[PDB]
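Weekly modeling sync, notes
Attendees: AB, CL, MP (scribe)

Item 1: holo prediction request
CL wants a bound-state model with zinc ion before deciding which constructs to order. AB pointed out that an apo prediction alone won't tell us much about the pocket. Agreed to run with the ligand included and paste results into these notes for async review.

Input as submitted:
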Amino acid sequence: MNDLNREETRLKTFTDWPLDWLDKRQLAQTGMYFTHAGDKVKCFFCGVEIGSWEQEDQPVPEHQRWSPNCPLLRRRTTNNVPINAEALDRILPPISYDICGANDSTLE
Amino acid sequence: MNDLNREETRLKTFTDWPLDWLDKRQLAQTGMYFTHAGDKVKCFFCGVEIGSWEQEDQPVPEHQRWSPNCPLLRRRTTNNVPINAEALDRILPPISYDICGANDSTLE
Amino acid sequence: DLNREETRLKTFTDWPLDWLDKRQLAQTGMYFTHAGDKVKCFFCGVEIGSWEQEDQPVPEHQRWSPNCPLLRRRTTNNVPINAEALDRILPPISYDICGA
Amino acid sequence: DLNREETRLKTFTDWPLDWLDKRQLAQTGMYFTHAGDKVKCFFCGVEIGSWEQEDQPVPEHQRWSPNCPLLRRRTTNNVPINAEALDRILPPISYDICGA
Amino acid sequence: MSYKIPVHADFLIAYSTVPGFYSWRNTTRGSWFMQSLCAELAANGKRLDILTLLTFVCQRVAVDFESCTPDTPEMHQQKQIPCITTMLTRILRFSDKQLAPAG
Amino acid sequence: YKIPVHADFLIAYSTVPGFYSWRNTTRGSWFMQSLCAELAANGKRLDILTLLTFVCQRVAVDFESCTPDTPEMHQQKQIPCITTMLTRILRFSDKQLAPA
Amino acid sequence: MSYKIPVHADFLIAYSTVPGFYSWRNTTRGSWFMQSLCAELAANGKRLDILTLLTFVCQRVAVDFESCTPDTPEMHQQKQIPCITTMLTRILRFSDKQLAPAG
Amino acid sequence: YKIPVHADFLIAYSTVPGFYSWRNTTRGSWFMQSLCAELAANGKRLDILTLLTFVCQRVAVDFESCTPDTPEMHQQKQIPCITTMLTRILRFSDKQLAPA
Amino acid sequence: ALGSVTDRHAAEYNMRHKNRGMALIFNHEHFEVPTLKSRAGTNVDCENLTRVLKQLDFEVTVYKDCRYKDILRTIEYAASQNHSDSDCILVAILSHGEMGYIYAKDTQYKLDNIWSFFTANHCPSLAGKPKLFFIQACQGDRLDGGVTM
Amino acid sequence: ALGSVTDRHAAEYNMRHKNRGMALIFNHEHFEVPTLKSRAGTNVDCENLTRVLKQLDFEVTVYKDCRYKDILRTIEYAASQNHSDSDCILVAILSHGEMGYIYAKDTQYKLDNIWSFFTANHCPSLAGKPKLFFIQACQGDRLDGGVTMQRS
Amino acid sequence: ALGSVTDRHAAEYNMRHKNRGMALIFNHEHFEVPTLKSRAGTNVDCENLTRVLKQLDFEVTVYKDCRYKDILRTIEYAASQNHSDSDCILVAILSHGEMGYIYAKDTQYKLDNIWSFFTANHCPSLAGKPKLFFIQACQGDRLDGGVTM
Amino acid sequence: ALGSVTDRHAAEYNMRHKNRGMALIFNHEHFEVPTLKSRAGTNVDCENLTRVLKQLDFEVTVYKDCRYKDILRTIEYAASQNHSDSDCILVAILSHGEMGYIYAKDTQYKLDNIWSFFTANHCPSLAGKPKLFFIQACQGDRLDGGVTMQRS
Ligand SMILES: [Zn+2]
Ligand SMILES: [Zn+2]
Ligand SMILES: [Zn+2]
Ligand SMILES: [Zn+2]
């Protein structure tokens, strides 16, 4: 299928998605897609895979927890095809600068 | 204080109760009361103590999980002073018969 | 080959561990593996090494191989350079039972 | 008491473990604890037991107590039943260094 | 150098309770045993030796569970203890597969 | 809280029910040999359950019957039977600390 | 039977990175090191030996963390590795207190 | 994924920086003695880190200087220094299985 | 002295096989036998068991109220299979039982039967591999009063 | 959530008591019973067992060919004692036996008897402590042919 | 042969004392020193560290941007105390740093100083107990390019 | 939630390779350098180290009093090799040393040099494998008086 880089394709993989309570839609929206095995979802932008969700685990923060570098998430430019780019822009984590001494580029 | 057996007394212990998200009220209602140490709550009817709650852990089922016999919970008659007895009657788990061969008393 | 006591001795050429009885050791089914002080029994395939300065060849063979056909005194292809020597050196006799 | 070699020997009364040199063992600061084969050194407080049929009293004392004043040959209250005997039996001489 | 082994080795029978005793069971949560079993498996099964694993399943059934039958006081506040007859000959662990190679 | 009166028992007897127990006339039973071997080798270091596992391993792997007069009872095998209901880890711990 | 011990024993200095190198730090999540440290402590600190514990903190910092600085490609996709100089003389564990007596 | 070029190194050198390294003329250094002692005793059984810990324990506890000609350097102590950046558990495992 | 590493002295079972192995659960809830009242929530045991097992990489398969004869078909089959590619095998059983027996849908039976399908001589693909049987049988008759602590 | 450390959930048996505990070995070698041929080197089992046990800090005590009635005297006694100061208790038995029974000097007996002297309700000094019974009984009747394995 | 159990050969540190011990965290975020730009979210390190530590039964105590002289007051104090009733002691430090030094609010300093307040001869309540120092110092200057796997 | 088993999160180093790996011991006993008195029984360290290492399945190789330049030849060589078939590599060093340096037969040198021959970028056959350096250098200058402890 016109493959996974498109948000559209990441959603169509969540067909037969168990775990009713969890936001199938927005989850796939943040680079996640169903592995079709239990509730394992994988990120197409960092290759992480996550499963066994408690009834409050939020898709973004939990993605962040297990993948602190994910290019999509830290907001690097990537092949992401956003079904709704404006939606992402609000949903995504703020902005994470990385430092190692001073290099005035933080809140400089 | 006219001590803990009263639901009233179990609530007044939840003063300065951290963990905003969690239902302070109904939690104390099911035999739980604050230990005044982190988010450790103890049951006055089985002496169990539970802490570190995820943002969906339900007070009843989680009480049940760690204390499968709790007299209050399995619905034995106890000194419980219910601020609202009708409230409890709906909130409490259904009914758990225990068996060991047949002893027609289940769904006999 | 090795079934002969003669052949089991000629393998102990370049045998380290001076203190240990090269001769009688080979006599009881043991032969040098030519690697450290590892000797192997040709009659049960056991291999033993790292010997303390008193480890006796027979009892230590027995310890690690409680069934060794040669040792429990089953009849085997053994070619004894001195059959009378063996007859005295070998452990007495171990019957096995399970009720009466 | 124990500082005398004489007293260290008289403690080895009822000494099990036949094979082991009761005499010279006590001679090197060792004495019987009267419990299994545990002997203790009076000059470093070490205690050693479970001996294999070749464990030598000196080297094994040395192994578990690398500093023992008696053994490294410091001057001590030792009352040697035979001082000349010790002089030959004891380890050579161990200097300690840290640069030059 | 070829060896043989008992045909009856490497078996493990871990059944609910000591011979000649009842097996307690909650109508709406399952048996004392299965509850404790699953609990341990999905909690340690990966991390833990099989024997010590089952020990804690024994601990769970013995410590955490009273009968509670308020209509039949004769069967009330009763206890239960599993029975793990084992003849394994090595350590069972539910290992996975991991490594990490090189450039 | 309360606990089963029948908990914390351990019956580790020689062989699976309805089977023989082999025994060397001049070295003792397969079982006791392996038992002692493990106890005095790991008993301090090891968990009781895994300990016994290796005693099972020993009896099962290291021991054939060897009865050359009775081929019907020859080259036979044995496996112990450890029915356990302990509720925590047994270890033969000592007492150690080192203060200040 | 009285003994002595180095005055400089039983110390442990587990600082962020190998000498002469940078220490990376996310402005909105804290340093690579502290993140991995806490992560392990509240996850194993009770269960685990201190040394192996820190090993996994090393594993975390080394494996899970790239720099990601898309404005400064020269400092981008960089790596970090902690440095645990130890001279403990026994196993540190954050043990509790447990027993269970009798009748 | 990528990993630090400076990971998986281990420098376990004799003593804390800016201190002496003690050495017996006729038994080798405090460090090497304790090192070997542990390796050939646990190296197979034990994790590398805890292994070295006990080598630290040995050097720190079992060893005083003993220099009776130079009291200023007498009864001195030593402690190793194990700067590590391994990222997983090192063990000197072998190869074992047993098929069918 | 010291004997070499025979590797038959492998400290642990090899559990890295191509796959875990088969796991057959026998769920009994209803019985043709008289006076045998059905088992309450014996299913919910099953779900959980299934769950945890599959999370343990097992090949899980379940059988509801089986007449005894069926059980044996099922085992005999399972037993005759190439386990050489799997770490082991596990069977579990849920139902009533008395001292020395277990109930099928239609009859009691001593488990010594199923047991014997897997001995090394009858099933070498598993020779040296561990066979695990778990039972939830009301097996027995006496009660345990316990002791307060 | 997460329940507190109840310490009744102690991961291990407490084995640091004032002393290890009692260890009673029952060595049978000769029998009044007919056809029961004496046990060869059942003693040498005993020595070894004794050895290793005492090295394990145990309070070891041994009983030779005991008539059944004696065994029970011995156990009943041992059982009625203050074990509160000891880690546990161990008993071992050496003799012939058939399926479901063990022989004393004079008679066979199912061990279920001795077993019951130590249940928590009958012996609380050991309530929560481990009781260990090892047996070397020819118990059973069938043989095991075994299976040959790939070289190793 | 075999030497007895000296118990000075205790395999593990005794960590069952009346209480865990003191744990002093030094959080630097702002500096009087020039060119030293403040540390971003160095606090959020602190919270977490505090959290996990207290969950570890520790007696946790924290100090914000301390002038060097203050640090030493603080340590010197802590050091002179009866630790005989505690398992150990831990200190942690968060700030910038260069090769061989760590920054206080006002100045850099080699940690070898604080280190020496706790040696057995200067602090016997901890003699034989473990002292733990963790540092999050940008200490160093070179970068690590790493290697792909 | 819970992340999958990446196996880059392997809990342990893989040590089951075709063979253990190389182990190079550097024994210094004599020095061209002045005032550097020879090392007593530094050999007996060597024997033991060799012994235990080979018993650990290692490929052990030793070098006596090496001029510094030789050491580097030796390392550079060792480093440029296919370790893909071995668990790891170990080097050991025996000689005098001062704070921040180690002595060769002819000169002192900071070990930071040898260290750098094995970084993953300079030696990928070992990338992800453990490199072990043990040193017996009198490195330093201060003494440690120690502290007396309660009997034990
Ligand atoms: Zn991602
Ligand atoms: Zn409750
Ligand atoms: Zn042989
Ligand atoms: Zn001495």
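Recorded for review: Chains F and A do not touch (no CB pair under 8 Å).
Action items: CL to compare against the apo run; MP to circulate these notes.
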